[PDB]
């Protein structure tokens, strides 16, 4: 078949992935996020936060 | 199952041998099986191929492990094999002759499998 399929991803914006579906572009790490800012909003009601200010 | 007739005896092999995964179907795999000491049985069938293998199979049985049986009509043993496992030995999707099979310790060693071979060996 092939002798390659991959090349070093060890740092950068391609070696971390966000939990929408493996979406990116929307660089995220904060306090152990790995969680997408669009959906973070939809989880304002869900637990982690309730808005108070 | 059988009464130690030649025809129902080779059927009893294939049932438990499938579970044992002893079946080396095709001449090349049969050869490698019997060139190894894993094999304990060889069965051949009517010529549909070259006149070379009929000689060679006896030659390999000679040097390593004598065990041979010859039963004609390739379609019988050809019918007995599936395409994977049990679920249709009728099967117009595919059926084709084996022409030779080699089995390893004649499958599981248990009931009538033991007796069918021991019956043949002492007389041959």
């Amino acid at each position: 078949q092939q002798l390659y399929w991959s090349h070093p991803r060890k740092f950068g914006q391609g070696s971390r992935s966000c939990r929408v579906c493996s979406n990116r572009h929307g660089l995220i790490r904060k306090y152990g996020l790995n969680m997408c800012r669009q959906c973070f909003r939809q989880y304002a009601k869900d637990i982690g936060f309730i808005k108070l200010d | 199952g059988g009464v130690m007739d030649v025809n129902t005896a080779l059927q009893e092999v294939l049932k438990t041998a499938l579970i044992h995964d002893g079946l080396a179907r095709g001449i090349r795999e049969a050869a490698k099986a019997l060139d190894k000491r894993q094999a304990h049985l060889c069965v051949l069938a009517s010529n549909c191929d070259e006149p070379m293998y009929v000689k060679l199979v006896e030659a390999l049985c000679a040097e390593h492990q004598i065990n041979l049986i010859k039963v004609d009509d390739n379609k019988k043993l050809g019918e007995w094999v599936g395409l994977c496992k049990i679920d249709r030995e009728g099967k117009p999707r595919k059926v084709v002759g084996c022409s030779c099979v080699v089995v390893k310790d004649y499958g599981k060693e248990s009931q009538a499998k033991d007796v069918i071979e021991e019956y043949f060996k002492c007389k041959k």
Partner: protein, 104 residues
Amino acid sequence: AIHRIRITLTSRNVKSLEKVCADLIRGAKEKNLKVKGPVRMPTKTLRITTRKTPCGEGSKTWDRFQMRIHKRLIDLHSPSEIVKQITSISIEPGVEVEVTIADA
């Protein structure tokens, strides 16, 4: 023996926290375990300051979210058996507890 055993409480709800602390200070003082009061530690702020608009367009707006954790701990010195017996029971809310062998 009598070991300085520390019952740490930690929560995010000030009602749920405080009343469960009170229960353990009553039940301890009732049995004269020479219990030492709550040491309330600084409440800590998790802040998240991020866009309110997906696919930024329109007037630029943001949104402050915050979570307030709370810590406080009651120090006991008494046999470790009766502590670990009474501690884990009589807790209604979702409030965490961590028992320590010794600290002092």
